[PDB]
Amino acid sequence: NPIHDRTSDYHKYLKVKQGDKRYIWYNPDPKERDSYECGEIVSETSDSFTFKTVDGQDRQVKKDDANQRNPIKFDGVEDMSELSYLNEPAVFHNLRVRYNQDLIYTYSGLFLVAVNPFKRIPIYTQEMVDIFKGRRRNEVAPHIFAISDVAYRSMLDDRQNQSLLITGESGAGKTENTKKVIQYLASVAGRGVLEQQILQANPILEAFGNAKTTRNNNSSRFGKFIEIQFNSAGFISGASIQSYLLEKSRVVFQSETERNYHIFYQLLAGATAEEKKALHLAGPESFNYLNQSGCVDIKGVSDSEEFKITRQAMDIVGFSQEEQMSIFKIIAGILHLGNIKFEKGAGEGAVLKDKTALNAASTVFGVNPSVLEKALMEPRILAGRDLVAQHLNVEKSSSSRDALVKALYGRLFLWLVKKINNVLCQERKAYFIGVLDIYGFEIFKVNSFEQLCINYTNEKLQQFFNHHMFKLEQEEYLKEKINWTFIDFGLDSQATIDLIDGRQPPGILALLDEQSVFPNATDNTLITKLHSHFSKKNAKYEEPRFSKTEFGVTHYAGQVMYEIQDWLEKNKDPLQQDLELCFKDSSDNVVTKLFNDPNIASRAKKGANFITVAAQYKEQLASLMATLETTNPHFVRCIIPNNKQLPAKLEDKVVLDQLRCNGVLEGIRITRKGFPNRIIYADQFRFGITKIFFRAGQLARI
Numbered sequence: 259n260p261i262h263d264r265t266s267d268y269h270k271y272l273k274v275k276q277g278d279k280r281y282i283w284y285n286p287d288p289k290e291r292d293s294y295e296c297g298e299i300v301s302e303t304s305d306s307f308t309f310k311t312v313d314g315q316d317r318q319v320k321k322d323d324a325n326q327r328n329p330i331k332f333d334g335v336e337d338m339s340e341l342s343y344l345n346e347p348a349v350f351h352n353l354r355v356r357y358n359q360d361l362i363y364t365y366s367g368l369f370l371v372a373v374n375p376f377k378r379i380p381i382y383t384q385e386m387v388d389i390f391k392g393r394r395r396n397e398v399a400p401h402i403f404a405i406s407d408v409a410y411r412s413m414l415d416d417r418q419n420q421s422l423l424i425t426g427e428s429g430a431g432k433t434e435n436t437k438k439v440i441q442y443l444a445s446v447a448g449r450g451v452l453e454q455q456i457l458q459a460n461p462i463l464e465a466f467g468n469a470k471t472t473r474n475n476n477s478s479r480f481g482k483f484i485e486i487q488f489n490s491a492g493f494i495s496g497a498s499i500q501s502y503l504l505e506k507s508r509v510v511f512q513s514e515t516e517r518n519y520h521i522f523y524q525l526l527a528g529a530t531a532e533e534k535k536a537l538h539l540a541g542p543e544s545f546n547y548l549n550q551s552g553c554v555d556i557k558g559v560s561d562s563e564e565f566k567i568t569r570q571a572m573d574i575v576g577f578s579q580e581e582q583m584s585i586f587k588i589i590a591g592i593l594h595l596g597n598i599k600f601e602k603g604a605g606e607g608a609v610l611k612d613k614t615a616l617n618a619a620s621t622v623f624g625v626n627p628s629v630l631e632k633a634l635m636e637p638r639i640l641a642g643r644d645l646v647a648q649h650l651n652v653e654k655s656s657s658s659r660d661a662l663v664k665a666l667y668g669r670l671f672l673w674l675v676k677k678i679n680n681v682l683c684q685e686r687k688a689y690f691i692g693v694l695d696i697y698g699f700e701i702f703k704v705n706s707f708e709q710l711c712i713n714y715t716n717e718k719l720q721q722f723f724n725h726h727m728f729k730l731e732q733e734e735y736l737k738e739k740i741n742w743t744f745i746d747f748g749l750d751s752q753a754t755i756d757l758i759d760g761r762q763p764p765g766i767l768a769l770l771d772e773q774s775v776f777p778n779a780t781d782n783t784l785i786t787k788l789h790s791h792f793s794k795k796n797a798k799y800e801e802p803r804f805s806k807t808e809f810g811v812t813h814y815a816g817q818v819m820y821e822i823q824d825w826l827e828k829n830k831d832p833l834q835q836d837l838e839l840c841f842k843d844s845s846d847n848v849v850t851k852l853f854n855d856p857n858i859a860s861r862a863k864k865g866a867n868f869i870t871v872a873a874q875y876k877e878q879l880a881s882l883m884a885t886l887e888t889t890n891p892h893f894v895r896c897i898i899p900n901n902k903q904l905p906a907k908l909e910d911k912v913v914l915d916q917l918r919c920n921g922v923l924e925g926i927r928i929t930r931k932g933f934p935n936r937i938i939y940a941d942q943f944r945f946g947i948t949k950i951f952f953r954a955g956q957l958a959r960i
């Protein structure tokens with residue numbers, strides 16, 4: 259048995275190795291508050307300590323300001339709830355002592371904390387999977403597999419659906435830990451053909467949905483909620499996937515050093531000679547949508563080998579050979595569309611001198627090139643009562659072409675997800691475990707509409723955590739008749755949530771919708787309206803001193819400033835009707851579905867027109883939260899060690915910044931209020947029915 263055998267790989271890679279006066283943490287330099295050393299207390303007054311620094315000098319500190327150091331026997335503890343002192347340096351210290359020993363997982367009350375190693379650690383083999391089967395949390399070391407098993411056993415024992423919510427910043431480890439949860443469940447609860455199809459769905463969605471960014475070589479540019487479905491006996495019976503917030507803008511623009519979606523590079527590197535001539539392909543350097551960032555490859559990645567893996571995955575899930583060729587025709591067609599060069603004609607209207615790129619796109623898509631040309635440059639628009647062809651200039655022709663491209667890619671992604679769900683999903687499941695892998699709360703140099711949607715999502719998810727914690731504590735105090743009072747910290751989030759999504763008074767999204775669905779609005783009328791409603795009037799909003807295009811929201815994790823440019827266009831997401839008509843006539847069996855199937859081609863109906871993008875997202879998030887409220891949740895907080903993608907480099911400011919805003923420091927302290935330590939009679943106070951409660955510090959003195 260590996261857990262009692264001290265020679266096992268389990269002991270080597272997952273445990274602190276087992277063999278056969280007063281101190282504080284202080285800053286040598288007060289201008290670097292996250293850099294600490296150890297000092298020894300040598301005397302005291304009623305309100306201060308005097309201690310010796312590392313170089314042997316005397317310094318004084320107030321007793322209320324002092325960060326006391328825990329007894330050294332606690333350095334490396336598996337759950338930080340055991341520590342006497344929970345100040346900032348003490349919590350960071352325990353996480354660092356563990357990281358120094360390649361121990362990346364640590365508990366902190368309800369949280370599993372996971373620090374990215376940026377190297378391979380051999381703790382995810384089938385042999386490691388087998389160790390965690392049926393073990394309680396306090397019976398085995400911290401691990402993503404441990405919380406997965408606890409969720410599975412709770413499903414079987416309590417007959418209740420479960421969820422695992424995995425969060426953190428870009429590059430922190432959300433997607434890798436999600437993959438390990440699915441791996442674990444497929445093993446412990448699997449047979450099989452179905453199980454392989456669930457696992458093989460992942461490379462398909464990562465090829466079309468992930469890309470290299472400055473923060474992560476395999477960054478997710480969408481969110482996902484994966485439901486693993488089980489029969490009443492506890493075996494896997496199906497799965498379903500929901501997708502959120504795909505970054506369609508990446509198809510047409512990438513910042514310096516980043517890439518487009520992986521699939522474009524996979525097709526160009528991996529296609530055969532026959533496929534290349536049939537699709538009119540060349541290298542990535544010959545396509546505008548791939549030749550502007552200065553990066554066409556990723557270190558350690560072979561795009562041709564990845565193309566094989568993508569095609570094998572498509573075969574296993576069950577896409578036909580004709581379906582696969584049509585998918586690649588759409589990817590090729592998008593590249594050709596990006597090479598169309600609009601130029602100024604005799605007047606202000608655009609012309610197309612060379613027809614090569616237009617004809618190549620038209621051939622692969624199966625559309626009429628003369629019809630497509632007129633739809634791009636001379637679309638018929640309703641002006642008053644007249645339907646009239648309007649000759650667009652170079653800027654507007656190019657923007658319309660970009661709109662076509664983004665619509666083709668977004669609709670293709672939806673179709674891929676729907677086809678996967680057709681294979682995997684069941685009408686009759688008994689129970690489920692859901693895993694959420696979505697963008698974390700983050701602040702960038704520019705935050706726009708998509709980032710507001712992300713940070714709004716995380717505001718609701720943090721409220722959900724705080725309300726859960728409140729209910730657990732309330733249950734235990736009222737089950738012991740201990741008549742002590744405390745507040746639900748979930749209530750503290752409601753002001754920010756209402757500022758964003760409220761109806762009356764109207765919030766930010768409601769005002770955006772009002773400006774979008776009637777005429778005469780601009781980005782200036784929009785920002786002006788937001789300030790009119792909220793500046794010096796809502797305590798969670800700020801109008802800037804100088805900027806005319808930005809506004810501030812006070813979130814749980816701090817203030818974020820957002821910009822307004824293009825929000826009206828983003829909320830409507832327009833595409834010319836003559837372009838819709840052109841592609842509705844396609845001879846291709848997949849393209850025809852992207853334009854003729856209303857479940858893919860259109861958002862939902864609202865009034866005499868359609869719902870906006872913001873209203874669609876509010877509804878999508880509300881549906882997700884309703885599902886989560888029916889489950890028993892589990893929480894994983896992923897932490898990135900530095901901003902250089904390097905191992906063995908745990909940077910004090912990078913990590914402490916995350917701990918101050920990811921809820922770890924605030925949460926572990928909240929459970930010290932009142933009476934944290936409880937123990938049955940057999941094993942400063944208020945008497946209960948079966949246990950002895952005790953305020954902070956009392957049990958440690960005993």
Ligand SMILES: Nc1ncnc2c1ncn2[C@@H]1O[C@H](COP(=O)(O)OP(=O)(O)O)[C@@H](O)[C@H]1O
Pocket residue numbers: 374375376377378379426427428429430431432433434435474476477478896
């Ligand atoms: N537990 C881990 N072991 C080894 N490498 C990891 C681990 N977790 C994260 N990675 C490394 O970090 C990268 C980014 O992780 P990822 O899960 O894609 O981040 P997120 O989904 O939070 O943006 C991975 O591609 C991998 O190189």
Ligand code: BEF
Pocket residue numbers: 427428429430432433474476477478479697698
């Ligand atoms: F880049 Be990760 F997927 F947030």
Ligand SMILES: [Mg+2]
Pocket residue numbers: 432433434476477478
């Ligand atoms: Mg990810």
